[PDB]
């Protein structure tokens, strides 16, 4: 399956794509404002994620640091990124269906739309000004809006026991972005798409 990853933000981002134990495609790429990156994700991939990283610095070998979403200091990510990261999440070809979502469970850094480019389902979007509105205790000065599990490391935010409720923090993300996951046991906002759909992830869709 093909994903087109498009930066509509006025600022450069460093896109990233991983399934946690490996890169997806080339794993990461600088996207100046307006640029697009086309990747192929193997059919059947479970638990893939795409995100943006902000304010990155790399040496000529592709090692450095990003203010948000850093993946072990690499340009070409092979592992998931450090919160806060708005996440486009997907599992493909699962018994004939694809499943897509946006999640704020690992915080928010850049607004996102995640839509099919083929027929048969809708997209989802989280494009509110979460960073500007972020609760003080969740603000990353490094940049972004952390999730409460990252900040507080409690069983309730992290959903450690498998049971948790919404929280004052999760409900902030949910109020602004109803279409994205706000905590582990949120009512799912997963969209079921035809198996083998193709997609576009747009940063700063507005």
Swiss-Prot record:
Entry keywords, A to Z: Cytoplasmic vesicle, Disulfide bond, Signal, Taste-modifying protein
Stored SMART domains: THN (SM00205)
UniProt xrefs under SUPFAM superfamilies: Osmotin, thaumatin-like protein
Top-rank lineage group of the source organism: Eukaryota
Paired cysteines (S-S): 9-204, 56-66, 71-77, 121-193, 126-177, 134-145, 149-158, 159-164
GO cellular component, one term: cytoplasmic vesicle
Compartments (UniProt record): Cytoplasmic vesicle
Function: Taste-modifying protein; intensely sweet-tasting. It is 100000 times sweeter than sucrose on a molar basis.
Entry similarity comment: Belongs to the thaumatin family.
Name of this protein: Thaumatin I
Source species of the chain: Thaumatococcus daniellii
Organism classification: Eukaryota, Viridiplantae, Streptophyta, Embryophyta, Tracheophyta
